[PDB]
Design a protein around this ligand. Sequence first.
Ligand SMILES: *[C@@H]1O[C@H](CO)[C@@H](O[C@@H]2O[C@H](CO)[C@@H](O[C@@H]3O[C@H](CO)[C@@H](O)[C@H](O)[C@@H]3O)[C@H](O)[C@H]2NC(C)=O)[C@H](O)[C@H]1NC(C)=O
Ligand SMILES: C[N+]1(C)CCO[C@@](O)(c2ccc(-c3ccc([C@@]4(O)C[N+](C)(C)CCO4)cc3)cc2)C1
Ligand SMILES: [Cl-]
Ligand code: NA
Ligand code: NA
Length: 515
Amino acid sequence: FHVEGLIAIIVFYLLILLVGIWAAWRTKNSGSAEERSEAIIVGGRDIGLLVGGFTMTATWVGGGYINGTAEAVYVPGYGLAWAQAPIGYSLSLILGGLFFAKPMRSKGYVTMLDPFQQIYGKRMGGLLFIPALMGEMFWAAAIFSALGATISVIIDVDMHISVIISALIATLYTLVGGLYSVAYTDVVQLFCIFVGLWISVPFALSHPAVADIGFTAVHAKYQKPWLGTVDSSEVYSWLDSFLLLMLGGIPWQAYFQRVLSSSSATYAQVLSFLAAFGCLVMAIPAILIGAIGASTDWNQTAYGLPDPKTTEEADMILPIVLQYLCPVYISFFGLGAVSAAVMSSADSSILSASSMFARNIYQLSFRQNASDKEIVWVMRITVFVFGASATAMALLTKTVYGLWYLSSDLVYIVIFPQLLCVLFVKGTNTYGAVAGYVSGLFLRITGGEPYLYLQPLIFYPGYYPDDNGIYNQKFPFKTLAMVTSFLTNICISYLAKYLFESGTLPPKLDVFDAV
Ligand SMILES: *[C@@H]1O[C@H](CO)[C@@H](O[C@@H]2O[C@H](CO)[C@@H](O[C@@H]3O[C@H](CO)[C@@H](O)[C@H](O)[C@@H]3O)[C@H](O)[C@H]2NC(C)=O)[C@H](O)[C@H]1NC(C)=O
Ligand SMILES: C[N+]1(C)CCO[C@@](O)(c2ccc(-c3ccc([C@@]4(O)C[N+](C)(C)CCO4)cc3)cc2)C1
Ligand SMILES: [Cl-]
Ligand code: NA
Ligand code: NA
């Protein structure tokens, strides 16, 4: 227990809160004097290029990303070949900038759910709200759990107090000011992440217990080489995971919040490209730390035998490396970097969920005659409630990671085909939307989730049991489910259009007014 690290982290938190409060004061008069609720969401559409790129990079680079890349490189049997997060993130951002985010910014939308509502109906727009909310909340809870574990590893401070304080600090400035405060804090937090991560690698590379990482990448010294390999029987699983990361990262409100706040559409394109480059730049020190951990004689350190992977502690390799192969102040620098990385994503997740709810459900479905003051108060109360709920789920649940993975798969399977259909396909109705929703939901539940101890209901070629007796799959059934959902959407939409436009079906049977 070192008091100096605690004092430093408290001072850092207070400085971040002060910056957020200052941003909220100075951006008070931006936007219309009557549309304050829409101001809190979009900022008046005046954000430049550098700020947009920095805030997008800070949003995408979180604790989970940094810890998972190092864990994937360190664990034997995975290597560098199975660290798919950086390339997937970069390709998703490049595809977004190339194809989406120009038509969305050209139409002056406020929230990602606006096209869905205006094309299908309020009921479909509200049905599409659940997966997005689940995806934001489970991701925030999982990264809060990871931050608590990291703090518990580095210092002996109780985890509950640390998690509560971090969540409270983020929620406070997100409540006081919205998008402007989030972006202005992200600008500082990205610099903190960069400096803290890059300062630690040379110190860890010079420890006497660490061997050459050029030799270890190709030859085995203490374990299997960390470059990894992909077997001929694991090509399809690799492609399935990569497609999940590359195509399921686009339909998120945490991305369209930055897209729709830009001055122009071309600026949105350029900010997406800059964010892709920033993610690629940030991915490097995590890989280096993972290689250092894989190339270390752990018997010569204070950790002692057995290895961290034998102790079932492979998810905490980065904090272990920082604590046991670096001096104390470098350890505190790394702790600050991880804290900043976690907060820069948690605040964006909470703001995105609150914006979606307050703008699209309450005002646009229940109270369509409410004043803006009511909407502002609803936004603030929603921010507080969602932050508290995320903190409670992080503290009192041990299955946060399985829920996070399942929610991400649900988002990728369901929302992405609907976005494609509304943007680029002409003639879609709500019949096809309902059909695609049902098909995507069914084809993912049928087929279990080992992390939640759920047995598969449909067995695909190549199923094998594991240690706990819960079956696994080797067939790319998630990509199949997504493609089936898209095709069902298109086919049912066009069939309904043909049946109602000219057919034996009377017009009175049009339950939804779409044709
Ligand atoms: C893991 O590291 C430890 C060091 O902390 C290694 O222990 C070392 O073992 C050797 C051989 O047993 C010791 O050399 C001789 O040990 C005898 C006692 O067995 C002692 O009377 C002699 O004077 C001589 O030191 C060596 O001292 C010992 N290291 C320390 C610091 O005492 C251990 O062998 C390593 N494990 C593996 C698998 O290599
Ligand atoms: C950037 N977004 C769009 C924000 C929220 O979702 C994502 O972060 C996301 C993150 C991680 C994944 C992910 C899924 C599974 C795994 C993993 O392979 C890791 N393990 C090897 C530990 C167990 C199995 O699951 C790693 C990362 C999927 C989506 C992607
Ligand atoms: Cl993350
Ligand atoms: Na972040
Ligand atoms: Na952010």
